[PDB]
Amino acid sequence: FTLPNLPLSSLSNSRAPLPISSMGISPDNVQSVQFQNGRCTLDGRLVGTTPVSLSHVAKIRGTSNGTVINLTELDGTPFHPFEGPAPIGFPDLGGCDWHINMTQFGHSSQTQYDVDTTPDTFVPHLGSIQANGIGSGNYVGVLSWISPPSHPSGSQVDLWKIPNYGSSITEATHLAPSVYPPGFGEVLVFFMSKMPGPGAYNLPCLLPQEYISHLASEQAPTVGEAALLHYVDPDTGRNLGEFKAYPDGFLTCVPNGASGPQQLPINGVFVFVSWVSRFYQLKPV
């Protein structure tokens, strides 16, 4: 079994096309996460709206009629509600407004599309989102920057959330399931990127995008209960810390105090060591 032999700082976020700047852990008020992008099992199963390629990450495609944008997949093929909470690659950043850069095949210009994901018109699961002034036409959009949510008024930016893909929060939208810290002092490890906008926004994801393409290619025929990893400094070969990767597609470690993986340098490489028990006890970082 392998993970990419590439330093983290050379890789991308899987929730937006941004370089990885650090690893991190969630705030204490966040336990589980339910990201829809950046979801891939260790045997190569893409989950949620996750694409193989970063060229599809945090993008939209659709036709505006001036009132709504009727969404398709990125290549123009139809999207249907049975397929997921939104088309493949659709942004999954909750807790913020989006500003999406819209361009067109065969036309000049770009247009900023401002997206509040809270109103009842934002129903990407049913293939429809408000146009909010975007004129009639077919567009491809990519997430460019974010800002605080328009509703509730005065809300903070909380990128540990996902948007409401349905007409209400009680509508079933085929979300990929939540990911939980597995217990016994283990914390979920996140890969972070700086996101432009009017604040110091840091976007967490569960796996770098290049890990997703690697795993989806590798299609490991063997996956055990948990993969013991070392985070290694490439030049010296020094083991900087033990981590576990779990079959559902996430990494953990046991921090040695509040001052964790966030302290580790970001130019290391995760290396598979061996398959271990689900309850294998890690050495604190």
Ligand X SMILES: CC(=O)N[C@H]1[C@@H](O[C@H]2[C@@H](O)[C@@H](CO)O[C@@H](O)[C@@H]2O[C@@H]2O[C@@H](C)[C@@H](O)[C@@H](O)[C@@H]2O)O[C@H](CO)[C@H](O)[C@@H]1O
Query: Which residues make up the interface to its own copies (CB under 8 A)?
Result: 4-6, 9-13, 17-19, 21, 51-56, 74-75, 99, 101, 103-110, 112, 140, 142, 144-145, 147, 194, 196-200, 209-210, 213-214, 216-219
Question: Does residue 270 interact with Mg ion by CB under 5 A?
Answer: yes
Site for Ca ion in 16-35 (CB under 5 A): none
Residue with tokens 């893409």: 46
87, 33, 227, 285: CA torsion to nearest 10: 140
Question: Does residue 150 interact with ligand X by CB under 6 A?
Answer: yes
Question: Does residue 148 interact with ligand X by CB under 6 A?
Answer: yes
Dihedrals phi, psi of 162, to nearest 5 degrees: -115, 160
DSSP secondary structure code for residue 238 in this structure: -
CB-based contacts of 55, cutoff 8 Å, min separation 6: none
Q: Specify the amino acid at residue 143.
A: L
Residue 168: which of 114, 125, 227 has the closest Cα?
A: 125
CB-based contacts of 214, cutoff 8 Å, min separation 6: 2, 3, 4
User: Residue 164's binding partner, choosing from ligand X, Mg ion, Ca ion, none, with beta-carbon cut-off 5 to 8 A by kind?
Assistant: Ca ion
Site for Ca ion in 159-198 (CB under 5 A): 164
Least distance between ligand X and beta carbon 284 (Å): 40
Site for Ca ion in 103-122 (CB under 5 A): 122
DSSP secondary structure code for residue 156 in this structure: P
Residue 124: which of 171, 178, 54 has the closest Cα?
A: 171
Q: How many CA atoms lie within 13 A of 282 on its CB side?
A: 29
Site for ligand X in 30-49 (CB under 6 A): none
User: Residue 269's binding partner, choosing from ligand X, Ca ion, Mg ion, none, with beta-carbon cut-off 5 to 8 A by kind?
Assistant: Mg ion
Least distance between its own copies and beta carbon 182 (Å): 27
Residue 242: which of 280, 191, 205, 212 has the closest Cα?
A: 280
Question: Does residue 196 interact with ligand X by CB under 6 A?
Answer: no
- Region of 54-62, 78-86, 119-127, 265-273 interacting with Mg ion (CB under 5 A): 265-273
For ligand X, the binding residue among 97, 186, 210, 242 (CB under 6 A) is: 97
Least distance between ligand X and beta carbon 230 (Å): 42
For ligand X, the binding residue among 43, 73, 114, 248 (CB under 6 A) is: 114
Q: 3-class DSSP state for residue 183?
A: strand
Cβ proximity to ligand X, 114 vs 218, nearer residue: 114
